[PDB]
Amino acid sequence: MKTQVAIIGAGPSGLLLGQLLHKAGIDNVILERQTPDYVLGRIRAGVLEQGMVDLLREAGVDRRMARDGLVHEGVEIAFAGQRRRIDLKRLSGGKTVTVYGQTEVTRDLMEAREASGATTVYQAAEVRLHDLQGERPYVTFERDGERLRLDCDYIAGCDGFHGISRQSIPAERLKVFERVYPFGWLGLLADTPPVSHELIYANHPRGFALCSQRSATRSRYAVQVPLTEKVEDWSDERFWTELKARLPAEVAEKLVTGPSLEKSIAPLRSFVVEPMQHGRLFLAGDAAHIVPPTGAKGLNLAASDVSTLYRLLLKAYREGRGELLERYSAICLRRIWKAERFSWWMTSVLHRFPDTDAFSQRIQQTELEYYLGSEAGLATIAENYVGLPYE
Amino acid sequence: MKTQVAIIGAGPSGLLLGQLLHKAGIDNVILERQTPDYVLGRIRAGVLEQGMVDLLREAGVDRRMARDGLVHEGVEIAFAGQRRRIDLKRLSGGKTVTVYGQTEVTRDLMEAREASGATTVYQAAEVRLHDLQGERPYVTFERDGERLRLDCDYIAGCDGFHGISRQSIPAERLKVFERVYPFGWLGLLADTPPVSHELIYANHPRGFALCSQRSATRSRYAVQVPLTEKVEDWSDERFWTELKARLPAEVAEKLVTGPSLEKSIAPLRSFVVEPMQHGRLFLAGDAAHIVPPTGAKGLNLAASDVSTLYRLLLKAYREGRGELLERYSAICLRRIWKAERFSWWMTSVLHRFPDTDAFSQRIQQTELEYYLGSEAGLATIAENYVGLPYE
Numbered sequence: 001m002k003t004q005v006a007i008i009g010a011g012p013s014g015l016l017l018g019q020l021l022h023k024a025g026i027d028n029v030i031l032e033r034q035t036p037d038y039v040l041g042r043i044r045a046g047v048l049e050q051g052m053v054d055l056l057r058e059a060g061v062d063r064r065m066a067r068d069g070l071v072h073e074g075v076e077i078a079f080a081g082q083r084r085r086i087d088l089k090r091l092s093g094g095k096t097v098t099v100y101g102q103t104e105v106t107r108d109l110m111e112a113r114e115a116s117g118a119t120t121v122y123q124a125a126e127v128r129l130h131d132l133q134g135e136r137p138y139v140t141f142e143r144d145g146e147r148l149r150l151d152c153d154y155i156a157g158c159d160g161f162h163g164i165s166r167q168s169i170p171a172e173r174l175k176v177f178e179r180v181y182p183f184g185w186l187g188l189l190a191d192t193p194p195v196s197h198e199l200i201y202a203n204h205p206r207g208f209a210l211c212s213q214r215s216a217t218r219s220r221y222a223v224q225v226p227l228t229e230k231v232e233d234w235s236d237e238r239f240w241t242e243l244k245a246r247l248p249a250e251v252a253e254k255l256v257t258g259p260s261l262e263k264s265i266a267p268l269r270s271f272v273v274e275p276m277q278h279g280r281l282f283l284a285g286d287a288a289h290i291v292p293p294t295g296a297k298g299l300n301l302a303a304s305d306v307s308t309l310y311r312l313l314l315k316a317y318r319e320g321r322g323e324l325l326e327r328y329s330a331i332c333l334r335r336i337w338k339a340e341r342f343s344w345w346m347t348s349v350l351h352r353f354p355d356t357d358a359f360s361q362r363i364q365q366t367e368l369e370y371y372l373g374s375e376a377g378l379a380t381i382a383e384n385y386v387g388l389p390y391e
Numbered sequence: 392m393k394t395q396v397a398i399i400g401a402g403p404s405g406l407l408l409g410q411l412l413h414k415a416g417i418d419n420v421i422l423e424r425q426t427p428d429y430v431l432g433r434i435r436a437g438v439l440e441q442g443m444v445d446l447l448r449e450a451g452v453d454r455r456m457a458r459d460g461l462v463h464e465g466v467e468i469a470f471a472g473q474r475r476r477i478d479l480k481r482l483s484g485g486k487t488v489t490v491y492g493q494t495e496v497t498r499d500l501m502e503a504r505e506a507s508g509a510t511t512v513y514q515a516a517e518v519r520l521h522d523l524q525g526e527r528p529y530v531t532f533e534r535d536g537e538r539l540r541l542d543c544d545y546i547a548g549c550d551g552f553h554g555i556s557r558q559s560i561p562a563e564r565l566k567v568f569e570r571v572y573p574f575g576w577l578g579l580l581a582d583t584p585p586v587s588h589e590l591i592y593a594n595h596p597r598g599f600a601l602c603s604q605r606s607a608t609r610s611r612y613a614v615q616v617p618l619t620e621k622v623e624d625w626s627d628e629r630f631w632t633e634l635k636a637r638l639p640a641e642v643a644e645k646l647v648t649g650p651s652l653e654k655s656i657a658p659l660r661s662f663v664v665e666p667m668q669h670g671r672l673f674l675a676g677d678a679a680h681i682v683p684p685t686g687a688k689g690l691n692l693a694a695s696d697v698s699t700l701y702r703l704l705l706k707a708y709r710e711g712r713g714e715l716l717e718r719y720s721a722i723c724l725r726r727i728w729k730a731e732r733f734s735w736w737m738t739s740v741l742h743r744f745p746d747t748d749a750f751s752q753r754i755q756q757t758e759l760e761y762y763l764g765s766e767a768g769l770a771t772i773a774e775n776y777v778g779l780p781y782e
């Protein structure tokens with residue numbers, strides 16, 4: 001089989017790129033190792049920048065989002081007794097963010113694709129990339145027991161952190177930057193009303209706590225836990241008690257608890273690979289970089305990467321300007337580093353780190369006091385939070 | 392001998408407090424271990440916040456300053472090839488800073504005092520504080536070979552980092568926060584024209600470099616060096632070569648070099664003691680806290696401490712409200728922590744740290760890129776730099 005752009009991975013990166021390209025006339029084929037259910041089993045993100053909200057409307061897949069996604073104009077940071085709200089809409093110059101589950105976005109895009117009739121091969125085993133530097137690179141995979149071959153012009157590595165794309169680029173060509181945090185987040189999804197109309201990021205001596213929502217009858221919560229904790233050790237009861245212990249008393253007593261729908265511990269990490277391409281292979285989303293979830297930048301960076309890749313391929317196919325595709329990494333890395341710096345900051349001022357002396361405790365505390373107190377400080381949180389502009 | 396407020400140390404803290412109090416009718420006595428020449432031999436600071444510029448005018452010692460001090464409306468940060476200017480006057484809402492040597496300030500205040508006829512005992516040896524919690528505390532010292540006794544109501548510990556005041560408060564009463572940096576600054580004063588009309592803070596792979604001035608025919612420079620470097624190893628020649636190597640080529644070739652008047656290596660440190668008082672003893676300036684010089688906050692925090700101590704003693708003596716003097720530490724520590732956080736930040740984004748991995752290099756670089764590029768970011772540097780308001 002032949003195609004123009006072969007897409008590895010059917011996560012939101014791949015589905016979004018595949019959807020945008022299809023709509024532009026560029027035929028693409030998606031290869032996914034798992035089944036649609038497995039992909040839809042992932043809870044992950046819930047906060048979307050205005051830029052992605054527009055990319056979806058552009059991909060033509062926004063009906064449901066316009067209806068169910070929630071527009072927010074502020075967040076709340078809670079520390080040392082106090083709860084401080086950040087008015088995003090006025091501090092950013094009118095921008096806001098939309099809360100809409102990642103699982104929903106995937107579900108929508110997945111519906112959109114199936115109806116379009118565009119090719120999607122789920123259960124594609126042992127995918128291998130070949131001739132990345134030639135004019136005709138190709139992909140081999142197994143469907144059942146038959147090794148098939150797919151010829152294409154370009155390959156988009158949207159297969160996430162442990163995908164095959166990044167491992168296909170010769171090591172000596174990529175320079176890796178990485179930071180592993182000594183903690184993870186134990187997340188939880190539950191069919192209960194959220195405790196707040198806006199999100200609450202809480203710094204507490206016992207660790208970080210997050211109060212989020214997916215809808216008016218569905219909440220998403222998380223608490224920082226050591227990397228040594230196994231999820232089967234945290235009963236629902238244990239979670240809510242721990243959650244209540246880390247929140248402001250006035251919030252903890254408004255909390256409507258309930259049985260969990262999903263629970264899992266995600267480890268924290270920062271990871272950037274430079275550059276993000278090799279010959280005719282271009283990396284996007286988690287295949288190239290990882291940011292700790294504290295800043296909600298993961299899904300959002302995948303969308304911006306994809307937005308840039310889509311727009312550079314339109315020009316190459318449509319305007320014959322394949323030279324522009326060399327600019328890909330440079331354009332993406334500028335955003336990527338800014339977002340990695342903001343995600344890192346958010347993480348360091350809201351989380352409790354082990355083995356921290358008195359001076360750093362006081363500085364973390366003061367970082368919060370200064371930033372939530374200054375008008376200039378709040379603005380840096382706001383403009384970064386709603387997401388910096390696309391270049 | 393008796394007095395109302397005994398002042399230990401004749402540095403700018405002591406002289407300023409002593410001058411303000413004298414003018415208010417409150418009699419004070421200053422005790423200095425060294426000689427006036429030794430004190431005037433110290434080069435130290437050169438940048439003053441508007442708040443101190445006003446405190447001096449209030450202490451009535453500003454004629455010379457109004458004439459020789461230089462008002463600046465911007466600074467320049469130079470990194471990775473580029474040189475970015477920060478317009479302080481518009482980003483802070485009209486504030487600026489004054490460049491005027493610390494040695495000058497001391498010299499002025501010292502002239503003012505001698506003419507006032509107020510008591511100053513230079514060469515006061517082996518000073519000891521007694522009865523700090525009684526109603527009549529006292530100070531003993533030796534002048535030549537005679538141990539004299541000074542009775543007073545209150546004692547102001549303005550004796551700097553290694554003074555006797557802080558060691559007089561029972562250890563179990565103070566909680567100490569401290570950070571020692573793995574480097575120091577090798578400073579240099581020279582009778583040459585400065586290379587810039589505004590200061591230049593430079594981040595370079597070889598380390599930090601600073602271009603400052605004391606006047607139109609006098610410059611002050613500094614370069615970050617390891618803690619293992621002895622000043623006698625750095626000839627003047629060696630300094631300028633090193634300085635030129637760390638600056639932008641366009642600046643390095645405008646540099647007018649020359650023989651040094653002064654040279655010395657000052658180690659970097661962050662230090663805060665809580666609280667800043669014990670009974671009838673109140674700590675001020677370096678006696679209580681140390682900030683790395685990167686943010687120019689040292690002399691400025693001494694002035695604000697002194698401003699608060701002076702104003703709380705006016706109320707006690709003048710209005711009989713000695714209860715207010717309990718509020719001293721709390722008022723001072725708020726400013727102190729904000730300034731310690733800003734000085735720490737400045738230090739971490741302009742200095743080269745040993746044993747730093749790739750990720751942190753990129754973050755330091757991006758911290759600079761984001762802050763010098765955002766309008767909100769530049770404002771946080773500006774408002775902090777010109778100095779936050781006095782409470």
Ligand SMILES: Cc1cc2nc3c(=O)[nH]c(=O)nc-3n(C[C@H](O)[C@H](O)[C@H](O)COP(=O)(O)OP(=O)(O)OC[C@H]3O[C@@H](n4cnc5c(N)ncnc54)[C@H](O)[C@@H]3O)c2cc1C
Pocket residue numbers: 008009010011012013014031032033034039044045046047102124127158159160161162163164165187266284285286287293296297298299300302
């Ligand atoms: C474990 C994890 C937890 C996260 N949790 C959060 C969170 O709590 N909150 C938040 O804000 N962000 C979170 N994120 C980030 C966010 O979910 C991601 O940034 C976003 O899902 C990435 O989209 P993607 O398309 O780049 O990758 P993914 O969602 O990982 O999709 C990648 C696709 O690659 C497919 N695939 C993998 N290898 C192969 C292969 N060799 N061949 C074929 N197909 C392959 C995968 O099955 C998957 O469909 C999380 C990310 C991870 C990895």
Ligand SMILES: Cc1cc2nc3c(=O)[nH]c(=O)nc-3n(C[C@H](O)[C@H](O)[C@H](O)COP(=O)(O)OP(=O)(O)OC[C@H]3O[C@@H](n4cnc5c(N)ncnc54)[C@H](O)[C@@H]3O)c2cc1C
Pocket residue numbers: 399400401402403404405422423424425430435436437438493515518549550551552553554555556578657675676677678684687688689690691693
């Ligand atoms: C080594 C050093 C270098 C510095 N360099 C810089 C710099 O390069 N740039 C910058 O911006 N800031 C610098 N500073 C900070 C700035 O110079 C200080 O913040 C400011 O001088 C402190 O004023 P002070 O009155 O609190 O202390 P000081 O200037 O230290 O004055 C304290 C006084 O205490 C007297 N004394 C000490 N012990 C006794 C005693 N037991 N009895 C009697 N008298 C005593 C001392 O002789 C001195 O006169 C430096 C500080 C230090 C300590």
Ligand SMILES: Nc1ccc(C(=O)O)c(O)c1
Pocket residue numbers: 044045046047212213220293294295296
């Ligand atoms: N930082 C954030 C904010 C919201 C969510 C969420 O799942 O709602 C998250 O996973 C991380």
Ligand SMILES: Nc1ccc(C(=O)O)c(O)c1
Pocket residue numbers: 435436437438603604611684685686687
């Ligand atoms: N950070 C700064 C700025 C100026 C001076 C100076 O001496 O001129 C300094 O010592 C430190």
